[PDB]
Amino acid sequence: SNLIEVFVDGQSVMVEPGTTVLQACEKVGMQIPRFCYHERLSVAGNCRMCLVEIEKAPKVVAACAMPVMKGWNILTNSEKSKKAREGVMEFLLANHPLDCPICDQGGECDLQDQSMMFGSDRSRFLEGKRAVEDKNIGPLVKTIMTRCIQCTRCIRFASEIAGVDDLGTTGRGNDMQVGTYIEKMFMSELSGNVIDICPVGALTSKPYAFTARPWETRKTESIDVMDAVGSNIVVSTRTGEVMRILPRMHEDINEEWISDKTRFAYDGLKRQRLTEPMVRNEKGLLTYTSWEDALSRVAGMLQNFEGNAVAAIAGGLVDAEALVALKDLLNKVDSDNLCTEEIFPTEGAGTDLRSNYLLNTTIAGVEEADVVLLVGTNPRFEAPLFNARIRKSWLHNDLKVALIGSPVDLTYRYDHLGDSPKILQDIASGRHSFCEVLKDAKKPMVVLGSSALQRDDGAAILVAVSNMVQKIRVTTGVAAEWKVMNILHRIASQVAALDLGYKPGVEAIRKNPPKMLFLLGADGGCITRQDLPKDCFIVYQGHHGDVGAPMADVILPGAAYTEKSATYVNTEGRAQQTKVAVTPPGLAREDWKIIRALSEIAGITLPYDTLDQVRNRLEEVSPNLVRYDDIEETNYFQQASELAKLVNQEVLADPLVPPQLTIKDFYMTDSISRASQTMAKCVKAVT
Amino acid sequence: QLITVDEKLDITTLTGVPEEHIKTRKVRIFVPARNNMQSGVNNTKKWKMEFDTRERWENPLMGWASTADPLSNMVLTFSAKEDAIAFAEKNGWSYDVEEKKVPKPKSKSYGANFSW
Amino acid sequence: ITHTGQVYDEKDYRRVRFVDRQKEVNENFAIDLIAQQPVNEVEHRIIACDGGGGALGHPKVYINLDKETKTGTCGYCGLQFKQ
């Protein structure tokens, strides 16, 4: 018990040695007014707006940097610590430009409040204010930096979370301006977080410039579907259209940060969006028609076609509830050709034991690892808020990162073992140098990005990695609950698909062409009318008209994750629930119901008729979909290896390369993104 | 006196709520999350019970947002999971409790950034 | 068409409204009236812009006409100032 005892205005709390004075007040429950101190950012002491008075002490101390000592009673509401705030707030406000009705961080200001609660009723600054020169930091951040309180949060985030040290302070005195010395845009993922982290409205979001004002925004808590980290987010909706998506904190998944894609592609959600159910008509043009007519177009073809003549290529952002409603339907006409666009090697236990296909070590385990051998992925642009995880654990802890992929910008110092899938065999043999490095690791982890598995020798690549994980585990003698093998995805509806029993890859549809295909939100080119039977009856089930719509005999519009109470699951199997922020547009309907209804018109009606019932259905297919925010550990790995050992495959010499080589690759990757005007502006800025 | 009864005190029939707004409607007990835009933690301390989001459409004449969900602007505020589950069960609504998410303790030190 | 679009598409049934009636539309677009104004030349690096008034104009903000490259524009009046 190394607790040390310290008094918060008397509550006499006991705290670990090394907790800051500000932290001591927090556990009692008091809040020190603070600027320039963020929990996951280094203490800087720039503002000194947190001056408090420990007891019988000569001067005020900075609650952000003073380690509380033994038996110091903090007096947070003394007559002194209020003159130490009534007089600081005098200064921050003195050089501040009064354009609060321009500053769109109007009600979202941590500087008006603290002025309005702890600061002063009046002003004594009868002199002249200063002005700085607005510069361009990008097409996402509007830096009206005459607002800046030189709190250096931005500089730190830019250097400690995102590894992009482009921002910095220049000059001394009252014209220290915290902007890039040369005008180089702040181009990085994790970029938009600066907005959320600058308490002042100096730099704010340019798309959401002046569309709203925070008191009005109704805030619904939901889940990120753009990437497979499944970052928690809050969708701010006003009068029924989404106005902004900002992060909400999840310790394990996104701890207060969200990607540039899943914050500025809410605009893409509002155009090129399907709404009414069109049906090919006349010469072939698609013609808007009522559900009844469009549904029976599909139902009639479904009754005519038998099993293995009906197939589904789902993929992208479809929810688990639709995925079970599409499987239950196509099995009621006996085709189990349901498939996903992202090919996960099934030449093994395959989709059968989750240990196989789930980051086993959780995102939060990256903090406890000792060496990570990333093979096949550019975590940065595939799963950015997991790249950050390895960013923090390489800085605050000591992770030794090794990449077997293309040498790529990783925001940290990795070891480039090489660009060849066969050198995986080199480490398994113990031939390559890093073989000992791992031998030295007590808690190692290996990450294989699905983006590799998508090549032709992906089955061989998974088997080769499983062999190395096997002897890495044997040589290290790592404990059982520590799990070395994990694989990260880049498609939101993959893990759930795989769990619900959907077989990955369109390989099965390729060998026998289905008379009728019900593409379920699939905008990928995995099959085309060109590769289908002459009949080629195909019906798109989705939200945005992109690739599957113009080659579709029927259009059954659906919703998006802002518009339905569906479930998703990220890579380590944590199921999460999207909440309806806005009602779905036009005649468009929830994905699960379209398929329950088509089944009623077809006559093979599905059992559930309300969503709680579909949640009960999910419980039957895979039981850890009905369970939210819980990661389950049963590492059925040992048996996975046995089947891997049976599988014999050749890893071709072609280097394994992540598709998202540089950030322009990243911006536009999905229907809701490829339709983004903001993403498009970002794409041309890079090009 | 002191009669004994064994119900979950369903006052669903004393409340006066039209059936369809007591049957097909899910309350979501949760402690509101912080506005990333600010760092004040005073709006993440009391458990709220908000209802499902139904249609918010457009008034043809002026373009305003219109609605038919009488229980749309409803955000009852409780002080503990226990007291929110009780009210929902009391009124006959379906609930989706979400556990609180207090930040864990993260150790912060000024000197640390000076090491080399 | 209003300064902010709004023009109804010919097919829009929302056009009956104006039958035997008309459409309230302001002819004085502020996008152009403000452009029909002389860039306020100044000597000082920074200048104020009370909105041409004290308490009868807009909150007073100081604009940095520091780069001839850009004429500072008070976010309230849209007045460009030429260093």
């Binding site: 090129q272 399907l274 259009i555 | - | 902010t4 709004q6």
Partner: peptide, 27 residues
């Protein structure tokens, strides 16, 4: 120091949504 000019309201909003326009020629 009966009239036709009657105020009529709008939705001065720029329509806030965009539907996919179906492909012009068949496949």
């Amino acid at each position: 120091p009966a009239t036709p000019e009657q105020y009529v309201p709008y939705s001065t909003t720029r329509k806030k949504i965009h539907e996919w326009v179906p492909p012009s020629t068949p496949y």
